[PDB]
Design a protein around this ligand. Structure first.
Ligand code: A1ALQ
Length: 167
């Protein structure tokens, strides 16, 4: 858990302008969070990037999990192998408000982080999932009680998030 160059926002939330994949390779965290969908199909965005960094091992394991257990619920999660990126990957489904899912489920989504003492994570429901990223950061800060290190791979968004937190 050798996190470096983060800005501490609260006693348990840290943030950095970084690619979560590159962070996972450097840090070797105990848990990396995947911004997943309910069928664990890592087809693009940050899920596709984490899967590609495992040379598709994450996708094969995910397909096997879905066959036995069925899909996740929106707001839910599962723990699978971290492969070469972490000890464990916590696959979390935030709501996709661009597809009509309820933004209130973002609190349920961040509540999954509280089962793990230290996590490397992306900003849930942001990007093409359509949530307001400032609102996602506020829900993270108000919900997560364990130690979370947020990697946001966009300097423009990072600066807007920090300037909002510090108002
Ligand atoms: C080809 N490639 N290599 C690396 C990455 C990469 C993306 C990425 C990231 N994306 C954030 C995010 C966060 C929650 C998302 C989402 N995206 O997409 C819908 C699902 O929910 C965002 C957009 C807000 C900055 N955040 C952190 N590290 C990251 N690495 C990619 C891609 N794509």
């Amino acid at each position: 858990n050798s996190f470096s160059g983060y800005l501490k926002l609260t006693d348990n939330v840290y943030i950095k302008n970084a690619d979560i994949v590159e962070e996972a390779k450097k840090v070797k965290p105990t848990v990396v969070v995947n911004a997943a969908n309910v069928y664990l199909k890592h087809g693009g965005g940050v899920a596709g990037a984490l899967n590609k960094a495992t040379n598709n091992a994450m996708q094969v394991e995910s397909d096997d999990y879905i066959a036995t257990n069925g899909p996740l619920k929106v707001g839910g999660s599962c723990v699978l192998s971290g492969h070469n990126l972490a000890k464990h990957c916590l696959h979390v489904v935030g709501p996709n408000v661009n597809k009509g899912e309820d933004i209130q489920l973002l609190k349920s989504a961040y509540e999954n982080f509280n089962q793990h003492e230290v996590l490397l994570a992306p900003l849930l429901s942001a990007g093409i999932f359509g949530a307001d990223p400032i609102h996602s950061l506020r829900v993270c800060v108000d919900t997560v009680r364990t130690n979370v290190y947020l990697a946001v791979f966009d300097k423009n968004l990072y600066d807007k998030l920090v300037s909002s937190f510090l108002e």
